[PDB]
Amino acid sequence: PLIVPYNLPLPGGVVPRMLITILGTVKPNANRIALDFQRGNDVAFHFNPRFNENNRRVIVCNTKLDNNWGREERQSVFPFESGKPFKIQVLVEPDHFKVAVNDAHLLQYNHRVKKLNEISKLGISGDIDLTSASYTMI
């Protein structure tokens, strides 16, 4: 088991062909989860499942620059379930982060922060039991 919030160092930043894998279980009465790919205090890619935003389940993605959030990206598919185990895979591609949950493609997020080799940490927070977090090159 890992302690949440968890920091996964990404030595030398991210690069295309780098695959991040996160395994955990959603807590039974979960409200929120976040992955934060960070460049110092900036958040290059925030991936934020919300289980109860006005009685709707939605994933919000965004970037934080100089402490300001930008334009949110929202789509409707919500593959997480309270109480159940999940796998998140984040593949860095040249133009975007590509995210799959439980082996099904979910969304892509275009790179707004373009100094990929300075995105040197991943924070994992919110209403999960975190089993493992790691990376490999494909």
Write the CB contacts of 19 (distance below 8 Å, at least 6 apart in sequence). 89, 90, 91, 92, 135, 136, 137, 138
- State yes or no: 73 annotated in a binding site: yes
129 is an interface residue for ligand HRK by CB under 6 A: no
Give the footprint of Cl ion on this chain (CB under 5 A): 32
- Residue 118, classed as helix, strand or coil, is helix
- State yes or no: 32 annotated in a binding site: no
48 is an interface residue for ligand HRK by CB under 6 A: yes
Q: Please report where in the chains the tokens 């695959």 appear, as a residue.
A: 19
Binding mask 70-109 for ligand HRK (x = CB under 6 A): --x-------------------------------------
- State yes or no: 75 annotated in a binding site: yes
Q: Which residues are near ligand HRK by CB under 6 A?
A: 32-34, 46, 48, 60, 62, 69, 72, 125-126
